[PDB]
Amino acid sequence: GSGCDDKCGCAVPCPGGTGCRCTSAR
Numbered sequence: 001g002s003g004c005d006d007k008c009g010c011a012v013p014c015p016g017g018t019g020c021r022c023t024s025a026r
C-alpha cells in the first residue's frame with residue numbers, strides 16, 4: 001500500500017490506470 005514513489009515506476013501520486021505497473025494488467 002502506502003501510495004508510491006518513482007522508485008516503484010510510478011509518479012507521485014501514482015498515475016492510476018495510466019501505465020501503472022503495480023497491478024495484474026500486462
Ligand SMILES: [Zn+2]
Pocket residue numbers: 003004005008009010014021022
Ligand atoms: Zn507502485
Ligand SMILES: [Zn+2]
Pocket residue numbers: 004008009010014015020021022
Ligand atoms: Zn503504481
